[PDB]
Amino acid sequence: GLPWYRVHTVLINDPGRLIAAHLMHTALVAGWAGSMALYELATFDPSDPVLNPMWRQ
Amino acid sequence: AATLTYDDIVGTGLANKCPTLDDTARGAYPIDSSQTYRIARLCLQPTTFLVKEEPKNKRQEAEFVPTKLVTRETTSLDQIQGELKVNSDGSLTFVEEDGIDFQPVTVQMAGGERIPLLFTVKN
Ligand code: CLA
Ligand code: CLA
Ligand code: CLA
Ligand code: CLA
Ligand SMILES: CC1=C(/C=C/C(C)=C/C=C/C(C)=C/C=C/C=C(C)/C=C/C=C(C)/C=C/C2=C(C)CCCC2(C)C)C(C)(C)CCC1
Ligand SMILES: CCCCCCCCCCCCO[C@@H]1O[C@H](CO)[C@@H](O[C@H]2O[C@H](CO)[C@@H](O)[C@H](O)[C@H]2O)[C@H](O)[C@H]1O
Ligand SMILES: CCCCCCCS[C@@H]1O[C@H](CO)[C@@H](O)[C@H](O)[C@H]1O
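A: This is the predicted complex of the input protein with dodecyl-beta-D-maltoside.
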């Protein structure tokens, strides 16, 4: 069968599933950005932009 | 105005507001210093609660900042009464005796910190 490192080649001649895989990557990336922002908001201290700005945190 | 009854007021939020006087009332109320006086009703209606921020330095100008009331229309002091003395120098001194002279109040600072206070004029 296909080796492990070629499994995604099944999409080369399947535009619909390629779009699906791209959609899922895009879902993952956007989910990352949302999750990351939530974690930051749950840890970020806004009380001192002078000596404790975002880049120190 | 059409003197309001409880049923006119109930649930409107008017019950937490102090009576007002209109623009014609720029007069002078005479004080006869042989006469004794009283305040029959004193009402205090808060419209803003500011909390002093607690800064890192020390020394800097720490400011009072705005807050959001979260405990609803439950904040006013009313039905307060007491002596109004006329002093030898012609000043007046109000001595609070009794009334609904406190309210617990919770305000919320930006970021979520809740600041409860006993808003009062006791004594
Ligand atoms: C847009 C970027 C992109 C895209 C869409 C692809 C797409 C593909 N590549 Mg290529 N490639 C890329 C970038 C890309 N490549 C980069 C940057 C490199 C250098 C690292 C490679 C090196 C490379 C090699 C050497 C090979 C491929 C192969 C393939 C094909 C099969 C992939 C497969 O089945 O993997 C299956 C993969 C797995 C089952 C597990 C991989 C686990 C990785 C190693 C660790 C975890 C990755 C992590 C989850 C990803 C985080 C995202 C990252 C950006 C931070 C497929 C057409 C193969 C090919 O040509 O087949 C004929 C092939 O042999 N690619
Ligand atoms: C007017 C024509 C048109 C438009 C507007 C697009 C637009 C797009 N194409 Mg392309 N494409 C077209 C014609 C078009 N294409 C044609 C004729 C072909 C040959 C068949 C393709 C083949 C093609 C492929 C193979 C792929 C794309 C992809 C993309 C998307 C990449 C960016 C993305 O995912 O953003 C992120 C998404 C958003 C911010 C959301 C956008 C909101 C969408 C547009 C609303 C969807 C509802 C709508 C009714 C469904 C039809 C959409 C379709 C017309 C794009 C983007 C939406 C890629 C993709 O879908 O990746 C996931 C992809 O893999 N295109
Ligand atoms: C420009 C930005 C960018 C680009 C070009 C890519 C491109 C890619 N992403 Mg994506 N991704 C991005 C941004 C990007 N991503 C962001 C911001 C996130 C959120 C964190 C993700 C999350 C994401 C996930 C969850 C997955 C991908 C996957 C993929 C690959 C799918 C095609 C494939 O089969 O490769 C085949 C794989 C390779 C060619 C290997 C790429 C190796 C990278 C570049 C280095 C890995 C370093 C190291 C070995 C990882 C170990 C990590 C470990 C310590 C935990 C491709 C290389 C999928 C993938 O890798 O499927 C197997 C996948 O599962 N991406
Ligand atoms: C739909 C609309 C949309 C909007 C308005 C936003 C808005 C935002 N996103 Mg999100 N996001 C979206 C969709 C969207 N996102 C989608 C679909 C994904 C999944 C891929 C993401 C994934 C995502 C991630 C991973 C992150 C963001 C982040 C953000 C923030 C900063 C954006 C930034 O710096 O872009 C920077 C954009 C780039 C500089 C654009 C570069 C474009 C290249 C150069 C184009 C090259 C190709 C082109 C064809 C070249 C020819 C062009 C021609 C004109 C000559 C911002 C609030 C950031 C954030 O704060 O997360 C909370 C962040 O980290 N978002
Ligand atoms: C369905 C739906 C929904 C929901 C959804 C959700 C809830 C989502 C989420 C999502 C999410 C929540 C996502 C997430 C994602 C994430 C990711 C994708 C991650 C990744 C990671 C990575 C990739 C990593 C890497 C690494 C490591 C691990 C270490 C170091 C190195 C590196 C960086 C490489 C709603 C309701 C809207 C409705 C409609 C439908
Ligand atoms: C659709 C997405 C689903 C939503 C779920 C995820 C939401 C993440 C949003 C994060 C923002 C809230 O972030 C959260 O805030 C409060 C307020 O300071 C913090 O709360 C912490 O401090 C306050 C005040 O000092 C304490 O009363 C509390 O016990 C303590 O846990 C949490 O520790 C933090 O993690
Ligand atoms: C989709 C996001 C939904 C969750 C939003 C949580 C409220 S928002 C949240 O409120 C906390 C308390 O005031 C703050 O300390 C914190 O900075 C702020 O991110």
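The CA atoms of residues 80 and 99 of chain B lie 4 Å apart. DSSP finds one helix and eight strands in chain B.
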